A paper describes a structure:
The inner ring (IR) is centrally positioned at the fusion point of the inner and outer nuclear membranes (INM and ONM, respectively) and forms the central channel that connects to phenylalanine–glycine (FG) repeat proteins that create the permeability barrier and facilitate active cargo transport. FG-Nups (Nup54, Nup58 and Nup62) are docked to the IR to create the central channel for transport. For the IR, we first docked the published composite model containing Nup93, Nup188/Nup205, Nup155 and the Nup62–Nup58–Nup54 complex. Although this model fits well, some elements appear to be shifted, suggesting that flexibility in the IR Nups may account for the larger diameter that we observed. To better fit the model, we isolated individual Nups and reoriented them locally to create an updated IR model. In our IR model, Nup205/Nup188 (paralogues that are indistinguishable at this resolution), Nup155 and Nup93 are significantly shifted, whereas the Nup62–Nup58–Nup54 complex is stable. Propagated through the entire IR, these rearrangements explain how the central channel becomes larger. The Nup93 and Nup205 subunits of adjacent IR structures form a pseudo-lock-and-key configuration in the constricted IR model; by contrast, here these components shifted to create gaps between the IR subunits. Adjacent IR subunits are nearly separated compared with previous models in which the subunits were snugly aligned. However, the diameter of the central channel is considerably different —it is about 33% larger (width, about 57 nm) compared with previous models (width, about 43 nm).
Author numbering:
A (entry chain V): 1392 to 1595, 1607 to 1692
B (entry chain W): 1139 to 1312, 1319 to 1375
Write the structure that this text describes.
Amino acid sequence: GDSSLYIILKKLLDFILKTGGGFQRVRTHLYGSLLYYLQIAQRPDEPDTLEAAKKTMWERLTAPEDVFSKLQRENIAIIESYGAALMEVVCRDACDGHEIGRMLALALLDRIVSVDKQQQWLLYLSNSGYLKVLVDSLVEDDRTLQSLLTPQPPLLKALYTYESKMAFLTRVAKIQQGALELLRSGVIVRLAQCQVYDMRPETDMFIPTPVDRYRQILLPALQLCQVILTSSMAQHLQAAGQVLQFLISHSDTIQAILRCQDVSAGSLQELALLTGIISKAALPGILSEL
Amino acid sequence: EFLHELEEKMEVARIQLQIQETLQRQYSHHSSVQDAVSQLDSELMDITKLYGEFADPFKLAECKLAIIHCAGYSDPILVQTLWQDIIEKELSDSVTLSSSDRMHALSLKIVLLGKIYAGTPRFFPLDFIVQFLEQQVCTLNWDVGFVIQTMNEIGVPLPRLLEVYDQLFKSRDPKPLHLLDCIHVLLIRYVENPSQVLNCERRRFTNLCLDAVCGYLVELQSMSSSVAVQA
């Protein structure tokens, strides 16, 4: 049992909240330990495992096992307290310093993220901070993909972080309250500002690499939009209208995406699916275009 | 300032207790040279006196190390040289069958000293020490995570260990298959421990620059959270 590990997890949270450590270097270590701990606790299991455990509890027909759920609950309580405090510290920190330590802190934020999805965090986090900052950072994401060539190097830093940021955004969108916060932050606006979509990627390093990369950005952002759309009530709701505007305004890209090949094709294929999901999920983009 | 004197006193006194305890175990000692114990219990002693007289002649490397911690002696060469001796001494006693046994004892010895020093970087250069340990243990059977686990137990945080280790990873021009494995074990150890990190993007991870955290950092931010420590 990684019970012994639990104590270290507590110490880590303590130090972070305290934000002692002149070195972000120190905090990077704390973030790394926390990341592993969160990951370790839930060995890759998916909703099926949870459903099986619930049934067994079903009810305690005899002696049940509910060990992993119990462990997750304890982790989440600890984390909550310490949490509000530490969320503040973790996000601010974020930005700066450490573009480095960043790779570590964004990964920590994402793991944490699943668990403690649901709950808790959405409220806290919401507010603050994050949203504002993260949406603005979408705009800047577009700019950051170009700056991407330069910095291929400084890339190492940022791949660990930028990808982590997209993931964090996608995860927030997966749930109702999270999607609402992102959308409130003016996601569509930042995306319009990034101008990632309102262009043609082909227009324009070995060229297939750049296409893979650009399309890659498009697939994640497109997933974030689709997830935000569906995650609310995609119908009469306001969300449906916003997504439709997204499609029409960035039409012809959707159409253009539909045919061709490579790993680039693979990325293209995923992008195509993502648009399709956006389409049906909304009022059928086609349906709207009666 | 009274407090200042009192605490220093407690620290030095503790050292004598440790030295005293070891003297009992040590078989190099003669009972009639009880005089040493009388001296130890009798009063606080000069650090240099403790170091030169006791630690070196009785080869208590651990004690010497702890003492220099209190002294706050920074000199890396001397500190490292002392470390080399401790490691070398450890090799002598070992026989091989106890790869695991020695594995434990080794971890035990290191963790204890590590807990005392780990707070300060001079005696416990995490960066310098980790490889040194791996290198030492390398001439032994291996299971991944054996090296890092000791540091975690030592009192080192998951976050601290991660950044330094990553640096070790990227910094080295080389194979470091070992580091990759251990870090792999570290991440796995960490995620399970906190609920915060927990889940699926992970299992795939088999240590590379495919840092799960690295990706996380890029998107959300570097802010992991507060330091996470082993319970």
